Amino acid sequence: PKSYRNYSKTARNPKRPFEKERLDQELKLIGEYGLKNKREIWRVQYLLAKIRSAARYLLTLDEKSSKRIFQGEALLRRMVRQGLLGENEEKLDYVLGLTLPKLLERRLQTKVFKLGLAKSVHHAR
Amino acid sequence: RDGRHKLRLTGGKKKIHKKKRKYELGRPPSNTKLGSRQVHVVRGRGRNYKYRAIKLDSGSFSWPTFGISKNTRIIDVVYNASNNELVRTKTLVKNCIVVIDSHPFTTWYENTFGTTIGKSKNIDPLLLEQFKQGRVLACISSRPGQCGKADGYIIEGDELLFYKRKMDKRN
Amino acid sequence: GKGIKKHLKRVNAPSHWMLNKMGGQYAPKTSSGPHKLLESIPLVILLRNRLKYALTFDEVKMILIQKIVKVDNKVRTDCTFPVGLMDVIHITKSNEYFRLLYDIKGRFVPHRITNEESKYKLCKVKKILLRKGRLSIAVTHDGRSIPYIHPDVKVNDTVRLDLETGKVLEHLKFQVGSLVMVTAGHSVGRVGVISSIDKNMGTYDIIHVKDSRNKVFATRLSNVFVIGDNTKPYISLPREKGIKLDIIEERRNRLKA
RNA sequence: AACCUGGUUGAUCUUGCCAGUAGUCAUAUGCUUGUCUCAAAGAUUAAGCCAUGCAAGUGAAAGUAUAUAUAUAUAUAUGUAGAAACUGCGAACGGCUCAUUAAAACAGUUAUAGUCUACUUGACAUUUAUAAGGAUAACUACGGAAAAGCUGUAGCUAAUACUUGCAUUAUCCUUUUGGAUAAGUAUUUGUUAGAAGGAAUUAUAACAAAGAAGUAACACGUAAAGUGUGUAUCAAUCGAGUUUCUGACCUAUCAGCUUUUGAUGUUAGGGUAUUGGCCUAACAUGGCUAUGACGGGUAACGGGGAAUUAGAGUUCGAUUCCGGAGAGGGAGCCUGAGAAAUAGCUACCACAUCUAAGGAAGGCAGCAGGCGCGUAAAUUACCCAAUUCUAAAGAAGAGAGGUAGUGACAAGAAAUAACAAUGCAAGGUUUGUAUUGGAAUGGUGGGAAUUUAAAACCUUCCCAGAGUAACAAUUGGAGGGCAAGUCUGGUGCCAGCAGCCGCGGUAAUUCCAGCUCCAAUAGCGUAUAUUAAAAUUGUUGCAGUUAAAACGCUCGUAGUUGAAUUUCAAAGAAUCAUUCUUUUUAAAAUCCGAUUUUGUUACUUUGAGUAAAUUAGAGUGUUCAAAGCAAACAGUUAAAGCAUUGUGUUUGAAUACUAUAGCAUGGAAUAACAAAAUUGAACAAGCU
RNA sequence: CCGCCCGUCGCUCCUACCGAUUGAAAGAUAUGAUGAAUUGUUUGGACAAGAAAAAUUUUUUCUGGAAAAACCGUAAAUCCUAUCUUUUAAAGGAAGGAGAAGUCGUAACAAGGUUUCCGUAGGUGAACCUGCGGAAGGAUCAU
RNA sequence: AAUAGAUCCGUAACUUCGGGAAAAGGAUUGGCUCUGAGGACAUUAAUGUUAACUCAGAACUGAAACGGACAAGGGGA
């Protein structure tokens, strides 16, 4: 009967819809990464919250515990492949500390603008 | 016809869904009288046949102190531990007490032992007197409503004394 | 009515069949036969999903119509035939011999075997029944009845069976040195040496089994299969050799390539 | 993301609620809507009523063919097929719905040493024979009835339909070998003996009685002897019926229920596939209950799960899977391995169809579709190509299922531009900003490749095809909460707005409009319900002098809670200065100076057994993502690997969770219980 | 304090309650009565086939057997009665809430002009008054 | 006129808690053949002799009738 393939939301509404400083920060990010909607930044911070929750749960676990010494390097290698952490990074505190612009730097439009090709981020989009 | 519609252990009434199933069944009883041998066939679960006897005259009967079974005929039914209506209407059931012909047993004793395996059992007088009469008391051991044949063993010793006292400080 | 069900939903199918969610609504319900549905695979999925010889159930039927594939050196044509825990599958057109076995991850794999080895199947006796005449029959995991077994054979032993003649060749006991393969637990697929046997009165008997790298795992007595003595397994094993690895260090050998 | 804000006042600090805020795989509805992917969908109310059509059939070696057609050497032998019909199997699966149901169903955990079990699989049998009997369909002829999946009579023929019925083996002894002896599968009865289980009235064996059903009077052809069909018993398997323990929402303005009418138990029987008050007869007076019985309510099918979660929790679960139940409501029954079956039958009730009026026929909570009900839900479409089931099993069917149609239920990605030069503003020749003016690209139309059962969609290619890129984005607001106007007209306590506080009586920042601005954005409002907010249900974690709230007081049972006390330390290696690892030290049984067990439970630690889907999570560039469970690698055209000339190779589909109850398991602490004196032992010797 | 504020009585609207009417309706149980269909058993007995004889026909017997009938049982359905549940009509009665500048008084808040309040009892147009015993939340923390 | 005896079942409002009450309202009843229960008395745990009608249950039976005549409440609001 019902289809067996799943689907999930990728964004979460902020709640407290009219914080002035939150709106200003969102507009700054939107304008300086040239993205069409704040739904997109909501997706980015939803993903960021996912990674952060995984990281803090792992940090709660004691060192050399099996769950930590499996999932920690799983997550760490995923972040390294994504380019979110550098070589000087080795621990989970840094993946806890990575931020929204650091996540946004990896979008295609930002990368192509940085490499050239398009002279504006909106041109890249 | 089995399982439900009763009261709970606490005395409460249980609501009834799940209308009656076939595997609960509950066939009507067979009031097996004694008469010309006639049995019917009941097709139980799995096409297994059950022989429902309605009338029997004869059957296998065992002298257990010798462990020898001979076919004889049932003359009467005289006692049954359950409802007293069963003996009055002369129905054969599993634990019924019957009177059977003892001539095959006496003839077998004469033929093998002589006179009137683990032989030389010395018999007993209470059963000897019954043999001399010619009719002997026996207890059914099969289920005529299930196997389709009445069959049992001669009672002797303390159980014979018990049943004789119960049938006839007495009336 | 409420007779026997004759359909299997895909998600209700056994997990080790590895059938995909979206690949239809039903799974092939294995026909009744030598092995339980849970501890066997139908040869339709054996040579459609594992060997990839057939792409559809109709192609499985196409293979089966010609009396090519033989299960225990005899021709099988039922599409949903339970192949079972361990036995030989001979495909004559391609001239290949398989033994059905368990990987360390608890899944059924056809392991390549030689023609010489394809005549030596192993059967785990499950019951010893004496019938009329004091004649003894061993009932094995294969659902097979072997009359006139050697009186030394016990209820948890195993016997090497010749497929051509259907006769026992030798038997294997269950001492603390007999190597076994676990069949249905968390440790399905592991091969060990049996460290100890604990026999609880009236409940499941547990056995602790020592691995090659000296790691011990416990299991229920009914879920083991004696394979050999301490010297060597009497059958060949898949490439993992029944050696399970910790997941944290399977990753390292996956990465090094 | 472990959050708060407006409102009682002249002002203040509280309690306290109202209101705001966000989510909802949560429903409806309003406005709006250019793409693609993904896909819920007559559950809520009416398990209400249904026109029509379809939804279970089946013959490729293998039961029965002079209906009939055909082809080879020549009326001969082979055949190939084959309508109908008999026979066999299936139709007890699937699909739908959630009415009933409150220890019932279900779930985890057992038992069946208390049972049944078709197909399939392995074993393997006992008390005229160169091949036995009638009797029937199809068919033929005569018919009846308005009508039906109605059928009478007469005549023949088959069968794997129905029914009869035809070696031999084993054992004792002199001792390869000679004579001798015996002959029932299940099932039932009586008397006995007795490879396993945890425990046997077990397997099995002997004796004495019965005794089914069978052991082929059947059909086609594989190695350069086979198969099909059928058959007794055992075993396996697909299952099923009962069954152990434990687990459920609200209600005491339900406190005593059950027991003639079986309630609880014993005995004997009947019945069943089997156990059982399941039923019967006799007997006894039991059984449950404030740890909530018995009742009532549920807008209650249960669970896997879902929403919301910092942690606890609260709410939901008709609905993919599993289990249960039902086919308008009841009841009864046939066949069958399996049904108390409903696209099977019988009857009653309620509906309801045809009728020539005599009689027939029905069950959409199957797929579409219609009426009704409603706030509330799609096509009387295509196909068996995939998944899988049934068959006489390749070849036929399947409204199962798949495909498309409707579809702003939800979910994911993502257009409505981007860029160069002056004028203007800001700044030491840097940013923003109306003009031009060329690129770029979808949306769209057409052809094609492709896809597909066919078609459509996606993708890809080729033609056209954007300047007011008219290829024109909306929804709701602008006093505070809460982002955004003391801007301009109209109205003037009216109209109206306003979730709350409030605005409106001529200057209305709040109504009706325009402009501008704000918010979210192909989406945005509204209503209802629910979660967080709510530490305003508080176990974590509330409050009770005065805000609501200590019984008037004491006794007191259930419940909850309960002082201390019984085996303590020393010594030795390794990180950094400490931390960490190891041995013994009373008594009783074990091993000839040493070899090894020493209450029960809770609790706690480890395991075992854990269906998937969902969840967490490992891997994997579906162009990303939602996803899925795949995939990856050399190859303008062949090296290498291995095989003794060819064969692609490497893989992955993990792990975790799966109660609180049950099984096993290490345990020193903390808790109980046990044992412990108006006395109770142990040892030695003698005695029975 | 020209503050605030209480109650009766008038008028309107809304909600709920009591209510004679042996009120009404729909359900659900239980007993009783009748009782379709049907398992089983028995009684049956249309005939359909056998065994005997005469050289087209007859008797007897064996099974097998359809209508039909009876009796236990399973038991639909209908009716009576009783009880319970839900909904509901109603003369009249008596509340609560809301509304409007209505009428009468001044109960409380100041020692509110008789301090207030509690329990109880009686009385009065209404707020209320009075008796008895209490409390300070009193207008007294005090020879 | 309607039952009306007896046994079994069931019994409301109201109430001064005693009643109402035989409330209301149901079922059964003959004959025959049986079954079961209820006592007293003596011998060295056990065996015999003997008596009332009183209940309960079951078959069978009949023109479905049985407190067969007699006798004998009508109830309810």
UniProtKB/TrEMBL annotation, chain A:
GO terms for molecular function: rRNA binding; structural constituent of ribosome. Keywords: Ribonucleoprotein, Ribosomal protein, RNA-binding, rRNA-binding. One of its GO terms (cellular component) is cytosolic small ribosomal subunit. It comes from the Eukaryota. Residues 5-105 form the Small ribosomal subunit protein uS4 N-terminal domain. GO terms for biological process: ribosomal small subunit biogenesis; translation. The keyword Metal-binding does not apply. Belongs to the universal ribosomal protein uS4 family. This is 40S ribosomal protein S9, putative. It comes from Plasmodium falciparum (isolate 3D7). The lineage of its organism: Eukaryota, Sar, Alveolata, Apicomplexa, Aconoidasida. The chain holds residues 2 to 126 of 189 of the full protein.
From TrEMBL, chain B:
One of its GO terms (cellular component) is cytosolic small ribosomal subunit. GO terms for biological process: maturation of SSU-rRNA from tricistronic rRNA transcript (SSU-rRNA, 5.8S rRNA, LSU-rRNA); translation. Transmembrane segments: none annotated. Residues 11-34 are annotated as: Disordered. One of its GO terms (molecular function) is structural constituent of ribosome. Residues 11-22 have a biased composition (Basic residues). It holds the Pfam family Ribosomal_S8e. Keywords: Ribonucleoprotein, Ribosomal protein. InterPro entries: Ribosomal_eS8, Ribosomal_protein_eS8_euk, Ribosomal_Se8/biogenesis_NSA2. It comes from the Eukaryota. Belongs to the eukaryotic ribosomal protein eS8 family. NCBIfam families: eS8. This is 40S ribosomal protein S8. It comes from Plasmodium falciparum (isolate 3D7).
Automatic annotation (TrEMBL), chain C:
GO terms for molecular function: RNA binding; rRNA binding; structural constituent of ribosome. GO terms for cellular component: cytosolic small ribosomal subunit; small ribosomal subunit. InterPro entries: KOW, Rib_uL2_dom2, Ribosomal_eS4, Ribosomal_eS4_C, Ribosomal_eS4_central_region, Ribosomal_eS4_central_sf, Ribosomal_eS4_KOW, Ribosomal_eS4_N. Mg(2+) binds at residue 58. SMART domains: KOW. Keywords: Metal-binding, Ribonucleoprotein, Ribosomal protein, RNA-binding, rRNA-binding. The keyword Nucleus does not apply. Residues 173-200 form the KOW domain. Signal peptide: none annotated. PANTHER family: 30S/40S RIBOSOMAL PROTEIN S4, SMALL RIBOSOMAL SUBUNIT PROTEIN ES4. Belongs to the eukaryotic ribosomal protein eS4 family. This is 40S ribosomal protein S4.
